[PDB]
Amino acid sequence: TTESLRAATHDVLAGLTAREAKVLRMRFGIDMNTDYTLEEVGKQFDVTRERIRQIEAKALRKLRHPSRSEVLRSFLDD
């Protein structure tokens, strides 16, 4: 369940703009031993902090979007 889940997640990540996907990966510790922050996204991408919050929001629109949601919907009952 975890494996098929995670592969489906990455397959959703592939479809986005670059900064979107990479930010949303490292911001959550995905794909790494890291745990990087809004502030540190400031440090790496560019110091802008809360436009990253708005970008997170926009991506959550781009991806939640029930044409992609339904690979995730079985995991609602988790």
Partner 1 sequence: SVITVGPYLRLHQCGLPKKMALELFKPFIYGKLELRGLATTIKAAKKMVE
Partner 2 sequence: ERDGLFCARIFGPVKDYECLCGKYKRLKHRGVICEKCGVEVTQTKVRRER
Partner 3 sequence: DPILLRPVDDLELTVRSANCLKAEAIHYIGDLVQRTEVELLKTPNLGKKSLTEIKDVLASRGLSLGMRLENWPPA
Residue from 54, 75, 60 nearest 4 by CA: 75
**Interaction of residue 73 with partner 3, rule CB under 8 A:** no
> How far apart are the C-alpha atoms of 22 and 1, rounded to whole Å?
24
> How far apart are the C-alpha atoms of 22 and 73, rounded to whole Å?
24
Q: Which of 66, 76, 77, 78 binds partner 3 (CB under 8 A)?
A: 66
**Interaction of residue 47 with partner 3, rule CB under 8 A:** no
Nearer of residues 27 and 63 to partner 2, judged by Cβ: 27
Contact residues for partner 1 (CB under 8 A)? 1, 4-5, 70-71, 74-75, 77-78
